[PDB]
Design a protein around this nucleic acid. Structure first.
Ligand code: MG
Ligand code: ZN
Ligand code: ZN
Lengths: 391, 181, 56, 49, 114, 30, 43, 263, 147, 133, 65
RNA sequence: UCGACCAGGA
């Protein structure tokens, strides 16, 4: 319990089965996942002690946190992935589903909105029916890259009177972000109204996603043959760039960058060329992957994943490192007994040319394990250390 | 495996030949040529970390032993048979792993910590600890009703008896967003 | 630290946690068995005399 | 399928965990830190087999 | 240990009605029917058939939580048409279609030599 | 021919022979 | 069980890190996530 | 002919392939659900164990006895014990099966679903007989015995639906597919280069004409024509999985009309 | 959990009818979230599945051995030869409505392990109970019925 | 209850750009050179290629829950093929006597630049869009 | 440990096929894939049930009392 | 029911 938010008053709901159940947006302040996590519950025994919980400790009151003067809870996982998908220009809903989606918002006025398209087929947009969850008198204007009051990209965000005018609804809008829909609804309409907003956005989006679906398979790690050629020759060119710097340093032509060894200087430029390579090899994939790419869609919504995940799975893992430096000579002048002595090549000092899709070589595997072990140690130590700092 | 420069009919080659391999499998089927046979015939050797320092190992036999006179873009990128001075050859690089990590399918396609997490959870997986559980009086015993041998297996599992005493079932899995549960 | 700044306490429960899309932000799903154990001392008043009599 | 390699003590099956240690009769040179009046040390953990 | 009986899915509890018809305050000529001990099987079928009725302005159903075998159905009709009659007619339409289906299936099955 | 070089598939026959002789708890027993 | 009978304990420069010399001798992956990470090795 | 039409493609003892035309998707799907979950079957629901010197646990053996398919033709003329006015069970609401087996042979003695014996009075109704689809006439290997190995038990089979427990599931997998050519655009195909080549063509494509390329999207068009395949486990014949599924759904609806009339 | 440190507790159980389905009538035994894959880069989980799908259809054992010449491209070719879409995806239908899911679900077998952590051996509640002698505060642990 | 704007335009360009059911249309009036138009169109229900001739009408009518078809006694204000309902969100003064009005039909945006609509187009949400030919 | 009556996924009786599967393999010398399809195991969910089974009951039966 | 060790979980 590192937070005042790690302890929050909740309203009981006696349900069957042996697990305490919680709303998914409340998951972040408690820092919980359901991989086997267990949680504590304390019952107040006094009328004045219940009032303390309900009036001070209650979850809705804790929405906007004073830690960083922004909300500490936003829309997450399924709902965040589905809210982007729901709010695309291309996404339209016909009457049958609209009615069910409308009935799902408990606070709904009972007034069916006029469909954006009336013409051959009455068709409602995603933005249209998601706006039913957003309360009246809620104004939000964002502006991202090429946002021009006509956002041709369906960029930024413009909500007037709790109706979406333009923009795809993702993490920047509906997450626990500073100017976000949640910081605004909490400030403008109160905590108990923003608590309803979470439920309504959830109930509508989860319904839509249930009937639309979403998945991930190996296919999403696969990139074009041409892209794969480009990626292979991108690593190849960087290997040569390194070899050239290796030949230059071996012929005593290299000059050290002040307060640095010649070796410290060579290493920096080698580490650099290989990390530049992993990045451009990665970017080559991220570009080639269509908008249908499920991993790209989770990256796009801001639900899970980042550039690096696409890079290491599809193109190239990259340089492995222990103690900030590359794989050192644990043996006399070599990293493994499969190499010759005084070998400073990317392969020797732990560069992983391959992607998790193509698979790692035994050497690549051992070095990758070496770096991974470093992370596992760091996590274990910086818990006893960081824990005592807190006290 | 021991690699020797002497192989009259050419260059540096592994002491073990196709004959030895067939001589071994003859004894495998007849259940004379044992592991001790390879050792006393000087085809295989025991190397500690200190002796490892003075030798040069090759990863694969066939791949890391011919010469030079297109490449499948689906395969992983490997180095070369750069050296001539090879003293030894690796029996199998998959033999770098232990009993727990040996049951992971494709660990060479995962992020390293994920493999550490499995060779930890596998230790807590219900299955069949021994075929004599009905005659043992242990404090706590967990036997999985209908165990299933995995469809995706490693060659090392043979020696681990995993197929014989499994610890899971082959569940038909969907990776999808459904009810949100 | 062990007995005064912190203590083991009565009217407490712990169990595995699960996520529910059909629970309101501020609700908590409580297993029936946990509800049947964890008690609250409601004072007998004329506004609840009939209700409390029914629970007893 | 039982492999042995364990003992039975008062009914319970016991494993003796392989205990790691630094090898004896081994010459090793170590650099000592900046505050120390001694710069380097040659150590040998000499013990009978 | 905290699992409810499985019969609780299809068997009406102690003093439980199949239908609970409640007038909807939000809209005129609107009603909300609660179907106890029922799943999507009945839910989706009625909603779909109510939509065929041109005198029906709104029809939707929801299983508010999957632990419990119940559902709500909101019906709004054209001024003068009682939503209860709208549901009655929709139900009869379903039975008539199923009767036709069964008769047609049976006359087809007898034409087979397997 | 009996003097033919070994393949990558062949190495499993050697490993089979190792475990047939040694077993998995050889270190504890020896 | 098999895994228990092939376990190691290191009682206490950088002991926890996976050393280059551990190749083919000790398992790179199988170590505890806890305060025994890198001290408990498996053959 | 009448309303929703039916066209039988291929029939058998345990599989019916048919085309359900002139129907709405909701009806096609609701029928699918009823066939899986709500047709009454007969299945062992109580096991009294007298002797078990087997290698298998009493409840392990009991679990398999439930999963054994029992004749369920005249299931409609058996009461649910819950509504039967007896104390526990009787002939009006149950079928009593007996099972006695002993390892006489030196070799392994097998225990089969044929080895069950109806001990109750079936009053001539076709019920309780363990379903044997097996070539050799044994059907379902319940257990295996050694030599002194014995198993003496009694089973009480009751009427039930799959919602209570899946052992009462009259149907195995149900094949369901509509719009083989994605004309309705109810799916958006995932691809690398061409979705048409990367996605295997359905057998059902031969029963609908292709989209004819240059033709604009028909928004008016609705999902009607369902390519189905009901598979029977054996308890009730394939035709009855369909017919009784149709009948149960009708009764399900009729009870709502009934409820409205009480109201 | 799968054999790729891809652990998780059950959150609900749906019967066969409520479950999504392939045209063939195959229904999942388990449903895992796609969000578990990107940050974790557990690619071998996806390959185990593709290989296991083929292994089940072909009747041959899937060699998920590490340092082999088995590629995703290789496996996919064998799967397309079995009449399914090469990268594992299968068109699924919603169990409640019967309508086609707009998305195609990566479906196939995967080896899942039942872990020794079960909720009824964890679930505990106290509202007054045994107290320690010395301190007069509640006893420790669920075993002793502690606070 | 009356018409707000009516003119006949010619399509310069049709741009989807990552969209499979949407296209951003670029068109200029045949009547006034000062008049231009930008509009996102659901091409799935109403497709448009370049050089098309379309009559683009606005109108206020033919605040009330939406009702289904029942096209019997319905005053079918559809002498047009494409009909949309939107909101005016911006009234841009683009120099001179030129004024631009921005509409949002459920996210499908529209921008109409002109001069004379001073006696017409209201900042009042309630506006339809009708397109024939 | 002894053949499951019915497939976990689709509920098809798989329990009456163990001996028939094993016979098709030894006596008939058929491959596993063909053996399964000859038993009428068409969907991979049924096909695993038999292919992936480990009849541990044959080991258990070796213990005398 | 005095508390030490060991093994685990998040
Ligand atoms: Mg966790
Ligand atoms: Zn009776
Ligand atoms: Zn099956």
């Amino acid at each position: 319990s590192l937070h005042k938010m790690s302890m929050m008053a909740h309203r009981v709901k006696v349900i069957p089965y042996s697990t305490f159940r919680l709303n998914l947006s409340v998951t972040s302040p408690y820092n919980a996942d359901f991989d086997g996590d267990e949680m504590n519950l304390h019952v107040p025994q006094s009328e004045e002690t219940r009032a303390e919980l309900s009036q001070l400790c209650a979850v809705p009151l804790q929405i906007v946190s004073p830690q960083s003067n922004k909300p500490c809870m936003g829309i997450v996982q399924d709902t965040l992935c589905g809210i982007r998908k729901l709010t695309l220009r291309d996404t339209f809903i016909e009457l049958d589903q609209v009615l069910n989606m409308l009935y799902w918002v408990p606070d709904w006025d009972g007034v069916i909105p006029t469909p954006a398209i009336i013409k051959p087929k009455p068709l409602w947009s995603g933005k249209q029916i998601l706006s039913v969850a957003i309360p009246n008198g809620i104004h939000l204007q964002r502006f991202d890259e090429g946002t021009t009051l006509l956002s041709p990209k369906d960029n930024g965000m413009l909500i007037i009177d709790g109706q979406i005018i333009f923009g795809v609804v993702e993490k920047k809008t509906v997450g626990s972000s500073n100017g976000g829909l949640i910081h605004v609804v909490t400030r403008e309409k109160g905590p108990q109204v923003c608590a309803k907003l979470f439920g309504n956005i959830q109930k509508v989006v989860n319904f839509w996603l249930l009937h639309n679906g979403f998945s991930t398979g190996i296919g999403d790690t696969i990139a074009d043959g041409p892209t794969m050629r480009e990626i292979t020759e991108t690593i190849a060119e960087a290997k040569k760039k390194v070899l050239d710097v290796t030949k230059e340093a071996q012929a005593n032509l290299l000059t050290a960058k002040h307060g640095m060894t010649l070796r410290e200087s060579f290493e920096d430029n080698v580490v650099r060329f290989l990390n530049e390579a992993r990045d451009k090899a990665g970017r080559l994939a991220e570009v080639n992957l269509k908008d249908l790419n499920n991993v790209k869609q989770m990256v796009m919504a801001g639900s899970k994943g980042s550039f690096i995940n696409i890079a290491q799975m599809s193109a190239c893992v990259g340089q492995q490192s222990v103690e900030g430096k590359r794989i050192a000579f644990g043996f006399v002048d070599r990293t493994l007994p499969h190499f010759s002595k005084d070998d400073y090549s990317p392969e020797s000092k732990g560069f992983v040319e391959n992607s998790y899709l193509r698979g790692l070589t035994p050497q690549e595997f051992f070095f990758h394990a070496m770096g991974g072990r470093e992370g596992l140690i760091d996590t274990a130590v910086k818990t006893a250390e960081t824990g005592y700092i807190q006290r | 495996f021991i690699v020797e420069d002497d192989e009259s009919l050419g260059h540096k080659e592994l002491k073990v030949r196709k004959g030895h391999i067939a001589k071994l499998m003859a004894t495998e089927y007849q259940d004379e040529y044992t592991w001790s046979s390879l050792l006393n015939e000087g085809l295989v050797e025991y190397i500690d970390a200190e002796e490892e320092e003075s030798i040069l190992i090759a990863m694969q036999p066939e791949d890391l032993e011919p010469a030079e006179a297109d490449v499948d873009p689906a395969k992983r990128i490997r180095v070369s048979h750069h050296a001539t001075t090879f003293t030894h050859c690796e029996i199998h690089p998959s033999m770098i792993l232990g009993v727990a990590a040996s049951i992971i399918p494709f660990p060479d396609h995962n992020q390293s910590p994920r493999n550490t997490y499995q060779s930890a959870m596998g230790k807590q997986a219900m299955g069949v600890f021994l075929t004599n559980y009905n005659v043992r009086m242990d404090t706590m015993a967990n036997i999985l009703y209908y165990p299933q041998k995995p469809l995706g297996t490693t060659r090392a599992m043979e020696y681990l008896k995993f197929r014989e005493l499994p610890a899971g079932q082959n569940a038909i899995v969907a990776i999808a967003c459904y009810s949100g549960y | 630290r062990g007995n005064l700044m912190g203590k083991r306490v009565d009217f407490s429960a712990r169990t595995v946690i699960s996520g529910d899309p059909n629970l309101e932000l501020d609700q908590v799903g409580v297993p029936k068995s946990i509800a049947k154990t964890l008690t609250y001392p409601e004072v007998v008043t004329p506004y609840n005399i009939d209700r409390l009599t029914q629970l007893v | 399928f039982d492999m042995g390699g364990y003992f039975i003590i008062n009914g319970s099956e016991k494993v003796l965990i392989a205990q790691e240690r630094s090898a004896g009769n081994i010459v090793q040179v170590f650099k000592k830190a900046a505050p120390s009046p001694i710069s380097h040390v040659a150590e040998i953990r000499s013990a009978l087999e | 240990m905290n699992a409810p009986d499985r019969f609780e899915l299809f068997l009406l509890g102690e003093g439980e009605s199949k239908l609970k018809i409640d007038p909807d305050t939000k809209a005129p000529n609107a009603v909300v029917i609660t179907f106890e001990k029922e799943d999507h099987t009945l839910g989706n079928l009625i909603r779909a058939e109510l939509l065929n009725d041109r005198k029906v302005l709104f029809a939707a159903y929801k299983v508010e939580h999957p632990f419990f075998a119940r559902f709500k159905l909101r019906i709004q009709t054209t001024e003068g048409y009682d939503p209860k009659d709208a549901l009655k007619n929709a139900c009869n339409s379903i039975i008539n279609k199923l009767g036709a289906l069964k008769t047609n299936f049976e006359t087809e099955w007898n034409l087979q030599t397997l | 021919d009996e003097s033919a070089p070994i393949t990558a598939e062949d190495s499993w026959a050697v490993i089979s022979a190792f475990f047939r002789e040694k077993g998995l708890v050889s270190q504890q027993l020896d | 069980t098999l895994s228990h009978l092939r376990r190691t304990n290191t009682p206490i420069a950088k002991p926890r890190q996976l050393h280059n010399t551990h190749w083919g001798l000790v398992c790179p992956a199988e170590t505890p996530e806890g305060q025994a990470c890198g001290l408990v090795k498996n053959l | 002919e009448e309303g929703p039409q039916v066209k039988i493609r291929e029939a058998s003892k345990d599989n019916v392939d048919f085309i359900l035309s002139n129907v709405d998707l909701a009806m096609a799907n609701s029928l699918r659900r009823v066939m899986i979950a709500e047709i009454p079957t007969l299945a062992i629901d109580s096991v009294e164990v007298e002797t078990n010197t087997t290698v298998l646990a009493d409840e392990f053996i009991a679990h398999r006895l439930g999963l054994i398919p029992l004749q369920s033709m005249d299931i409609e003329q058996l009461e649910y014990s819950r509504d039967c006015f007896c104390e526990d069970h009787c002939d009006k609401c149950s079928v009593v099966l007996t099972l006695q087996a002993f390892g006489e042979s030196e070799s392994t003695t097998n225990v089969y679903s044929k080895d069950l014996v109806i001990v109750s009075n079936l009053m001539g109704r076709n019920i309780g007989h363990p379903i044997i689809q097996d070539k050799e006439g044994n059907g379902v290997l319940i257990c295996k015995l050694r030599k002194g190995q014995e198993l003496k038990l009694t089973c009480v089979a009751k009427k039930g639906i799959a919602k209570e427990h899946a052992k009462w599931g009259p149907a195995a997998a149900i094949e369901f597919e509509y719009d083989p050519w994605n004309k309705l655009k109810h799916t958006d195909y995932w691809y690398e280069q061409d979705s048409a080549k990367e996605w295997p063509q359905s057998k059902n494509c031969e029963y609908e004409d292709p989209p004819n390329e240059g033709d604009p999207f028909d928004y008016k068009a609705q999902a009607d024509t369902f390519y189905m395949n009901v598979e029977s486990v054996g308890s009730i014949p394939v035709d009855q999985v369909v017919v009784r599924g149709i009948d149960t759904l009708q009764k399900k609806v009729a009870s709502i009309l009934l409820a409205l009339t009480q109201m | 959990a799968s054999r790729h440190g891809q652990k998780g507790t059950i959150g609900i159980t749906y019967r066969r009818e409520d479950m999504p389905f392939t045209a063939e009538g195959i229904v999942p035994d388990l449903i895992i979230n796609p969000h578990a894959i990107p940050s974790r880069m557990t690619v071998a989980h996806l390959i185990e599945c593709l290989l296991s799908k083929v292994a089940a259809l072909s009747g041959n054992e899937g060699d998920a051995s590490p340092f082999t010449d088995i590629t995703v491209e290789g496996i996919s070719k064998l799967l397309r030869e079995h009449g399914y879409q090469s990268r594992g995806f299968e068109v699924m239908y919603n169990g409640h409505t019967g309508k086609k899911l707009m998305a195609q679900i990566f479906f196939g077998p995967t080896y899942y392990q039942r872990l020794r952590h079960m909720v009824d051996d964890k679930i505990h509640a106290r509202a007054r109970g045994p107290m320690q002698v010395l301190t007069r505060q509640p006893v420790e642990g669920r075993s002793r019925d502690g606070g | 209850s009356n018409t707000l704007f009516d003119d006949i335009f010619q399509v310069s360009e049709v741009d989807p750009g990552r969209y499979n059911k949407v296209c951003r249309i670029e068109a200029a009036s045949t009547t006034q050179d000062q008049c231009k138009l930008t509009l996102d169109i659901n091409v799935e229900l109403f497709p448009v290629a370049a050089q098309d001739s379309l009559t683009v009408t606005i109108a206020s009518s033919l605040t009330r829950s939406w009702r289904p078809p029942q096209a019997g006694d319905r005053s079918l204000a559809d002498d047009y093929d494409y009909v949309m309902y939107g909101t005016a969100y911006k009234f841009e003064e683009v120099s001179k006597d030129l004024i631009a009005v921005y509409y949002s039909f459920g996210g499908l945006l529209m921008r109409l630049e002109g001069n004379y609509r001073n006696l017409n187009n209201l900042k009042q949400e309630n506006a339809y869009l009708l397109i024939r030919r | 440990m002894i053949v499951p009556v019915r497939c976990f996924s689709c509920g098809k009786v798989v329990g009456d096929k163990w001996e028939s599967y094993l016979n098709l393999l030894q006596e008939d010398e058929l491959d596993e894939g063909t053996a399964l399809s000859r038993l009428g195991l068409k969907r991979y969910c049924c096909r695993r049930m038999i292919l992936t089974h480990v009849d541990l009951i044959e080991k258990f039966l070796r213990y005398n009392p």
